[model samples]
Structure formats: C-alpha cells, structure tokens
Target: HHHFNLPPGNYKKPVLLYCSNGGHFLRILPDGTVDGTRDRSDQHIQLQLSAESVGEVYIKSTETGQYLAMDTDGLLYGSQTPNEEILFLERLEENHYNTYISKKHAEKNWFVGLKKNGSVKRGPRTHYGQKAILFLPLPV
Candidate 1:
C-alpha cells in the first residue's frame, strides 16, 4: 500500500491537493497526509483547512481558471504562503491528468488511490513527487 506519513505540528498552512479533473482536497493539520491500501479502494483522504490550528488552504482550476478561498465558512481573502485562505476547484475535462492515480473519480467531491508496486518489472525507478495545485470554484 502507499504509505503517506506526515508528522504532527509541522505544517503552518493546509496541505494542498490538485486532482486535475475536479477540485482537490486539503488538510490544515500539520501531520496530515493521504494514504491508501494495497487494494486501491481503501484510501484515506482528509481535509484539515477548517481547523483553527492550521493556517489556510488555496486551490485553482486549469479549465475554469478560477480560484476558491475557504476557511470554516467557505470563503477567503488576501493572504500569504505558509498560511493563506482555504479553497478548491472543479474538474474541467476527463482524463486531463496523467499521473499516478489511486482512482479516477475526479468528478466527485473527493477521490483516493492505492499504492503501486513497480519493483517487480525493473527493481526501482526514480520518481519525483506528485505535481498538483489546489483550485477553488467561482462564487455564484
């Protein structure tokens, strides 16, 4: 399974998540992380931006090109890094992102993926961290 362990009391702001298709999820907790099981169905997604301990969360969309600011009530104003507002965005298209995916249900409010084992084919390969940005929906 994919092991994502975040130490507690380290993050000043919420952890940003960018799913590409839809909006991403975030957790304001310092010791927050996204973890999954071997089956890929048993995934753990957490949102911690609502907490007072963590700073704030911000997100943007590639399709809509809109930004969302959220706190506990779901709205944000001006802020800076390491601490900002909370926000998320919706998906613009299908199959828009091509990366490691535990699941492909970005249209929904949340999603999760499983840890993959690629050591059998080759031993081990170099991989960079996942690339994703938070997005927020435009207020109506």
Candidate 2:
C-alpha cells in the first residue's frame, strides 16, 4: 500500500540498523544477545536482512548466525533457527525509516521496538510509526 517499500535484494552485507529515536544501532552479541547500543562494532553490527516479498523480511545476525525472534510474551530474542516468529514485516515510514512487526503475530500487532533508555522493548503493545521503532539501515 506504500510506494516507499524497502528495496528487497541480497542485503547480506554489513548493514547497520540504527534507530532514529533510540540513537543506537542493533547489536547481536556472541551469546545471541540482541540489544541497542550507541557504540559501533563492525563485527556484531552486521545484519543480513532479506525480503523476498514486500513487507516480509528475515533478520539474521552474522555474529552468531541467529535469527531475530519474538515470543508470545512480547520479548525479542535470538532463535537458533528461524521459525514463523522470525518472519517480520518491514514497514517503511514516511521519513524513510522502517518499522518491523511480526508477520506471524500480525494479528497481535507485535512490533520490534527499542526502549527510550536504549534496550530491547517488548514486541507487543507497540504503537505504529513510533520513532523508537523507526530504523535507518546503513551499509558499513
């Protein structure tokens, strides 16, 4: 329904996802810990986000080869392998930033968001188009 869809391609490169509101980028640690940090790490910051179709995307961290997952409790974590929870829909906002929601939990409206204090947020009960969920993907 939007013309500004994120160009789907082989973005298995060194992509850094920086949130406009959180002022930090997502970091996937060696232990499969996913969080937002103001600092940058060339190693842990790389993400492999691929969307074969509009609105659906798969977010994988190159650090531990784990895929991002959202549980029923609204918490975000790293899955050893991708399940239906790993399928998140990328919604590009008017500001050219993007917000992601769980494709499987689409009916529940679980979106990926960062806390105002720079931490992973509960995926559920998130407002649409919030700045905390708006991310700008940069190739580093």
Candidate 3:
C-alpha cells in the first residue's frame, strides 16, 4: 500500500527534464536499466511520467518502459517494478521545476541529479548549486 493518497486516474504524460548545468538529459540504459547520461536521443529522450501517490510520481523511460530506480547507495537506475525509490517531484517552482527525492530515503534528503561529468546520481538536497538538484520539464 502507498503511504500517500493518490487520485483515481494516475496522471501520466511524456516529457523530458534536462539538467540546467550540464545540458545533459537523463537516460535509462537497457541492461539492469541504470540511469545514465546521454547527449540526446529520440529513443531515450522521452520520459513517461505517472503519478504513484500524492505529490509523488514515477519516471519511466518511454523507450524501454523501465521505471527509474534508486538503490541503497542513492544511485539511480531503471527497473520494471515501482517502489519507494520512485518518489518525488518536490516543487521548487510553481510548475516549472522540481527536486526529485526518494521517499525511501526521505530522511537523507537525497535528490536525483547529474554529476560533474553528466552521470545521473543522487546528492544532498541542501546543495545550492543547481546541477544535481534541479530538473525542468520540457515543453509539451
């Protein structure tokens, strides 16, 4: 059972949230489906957004239909099952941006973001530098 109350028709849509600093988009690779960095690919470019719970959503790759997954080390990857790791779109702006945090690791405040080299990873949400923290939804 989910902790948050979700509405009936899970809000699902397709879009991309690019990293503001590196200009790299989030991608999910096939084997084990880990979240990684790729310049841009129509195949991996589209992300399917689906509401998992109240104020929480799961990001899935439209290419492979894999859910973006987070591990114990706070690393990101993709998998078939939806879990607590696929959590937030914690509002940073009205509807423009969000800080994606894991409900499973809520105490740690780990937000999904890109590293210096554009690899997808999780870091402290308190970091002010927008690199690994901010995600902006692309225009529909």
Candidate 4:
C-alpha cells in the first residue's frame, strides 16, 4: 500500500485502526487474504502489519505492479490487570510468519494474536525481540 494519508496521531495507547494504500481502501483478513482496495481486476498487493516498522509493509512488484500493505496497531500494552504488561502483536494462521515492532517504543515488542481460523479462540501473548513471524505462500 502506498500514498495513504492517515491523520497524525500520537498512537501512544492501545488502539484499533485500519491502514490502507494508494489512498484506497482494501479488505484484509487475518487468514492472509488481501483483495484490491478498488479494482478487482487490477493487480492486487499483499499486506502485512509490522510492529517493528513504522507505517505499513507492502509486497510490491515492478514487473507485476502488485503489492500488499500491512497495518500495525502498534500497542505496547495489551492489558492492565494483575499488573501492567507489555504486549507484542502478531498474526498466526495455518502456516505463516512475519515480524513487527513498535515505532513509539522501539524497545517494546509487537503483540501476537493467534486464531485457529478467523476467531480469537486463541488470544494474544506478548513476546520480546523478533517474535510472531507470519509466513504464507502464494494463493493464501
């Protein structure tokens, strides 16, 4: 995803938001399926949300002119019960791995939310360093 103008925010707290590209809206799935934000016939891009990097990650191809965009929630703290805990976010499907880090707190790791299919039957577990990698083959 490219050329997206998102409102400037501190993003210092745990939050929920959506990221898009080309200033266009795309449909993303936790299962690793990304559809075109506008034209279905147009070359589609793959999206991955990384907490390790700022903004988003997009799979681009100069030959095919297709790519993907990832949107990271970038929340370091997921819970405040018992004791305040640091949270790193990631997505795990049948077979996929990816990495994320926070732009705000570079020291903070991204949280991972596991789902058997599409539901959060498996909740999020915090991790440090290079954790919660999502990898999926084409036609995912």
TM-score for each of the candidates: 0.19, 0.86, 0.76, 0.26
- lDDT of candidate 2 over 26-78, digit per residue (tens): 77677767788877754776788888476678888877788888888888888
Model 3 weakest lDDT span, ten residues long: 1-10
Error of 2 at 118 (Å): 1.4
Ranking by lDDT: 2, 3, 4, 1
Q: Which stretches of candidate 3 lie over 4 Å from their true place?
A: 1-12, 33-38, 93-95, 124-129
Score candidate 1 by lDDT.
0.25
Give the top-scoring candidate (lDDT).
2
* Candidate 4 ranges beyond 4 A from true positions: 1-45, 48-97, 117-124, 128-132, 137-140
Best by TM-score: 2
Superposed Cα deviation of residue 67, candidate 1 (Å): 17
Q: On residues 40-120, what C-alpha lDDT tens digit does candidate 4 reach at each position?
A: 333322322223334433232222332222224432222212121222223333233333322222343333222222221
Q: Rate the local accuracy (lDDT) of all candidates.
A: 0.25, 0.76, 0.65, 0.28
The digit string of per-residue lDDT tens for model 1 on 19-86 reads: 33233332222222222212212122222233232222233322232333323322222222333333
Comparing 1 and 3 on TM-score, the stronger one? 3
lDDT of the structure predicted as candidate 3: 0.65
**lDDT score, residue 7, model 4?**
24
lDDT of 1 at 107: 26
Against the hidden true structure, what lDDT does model 4 obtain? 0.28
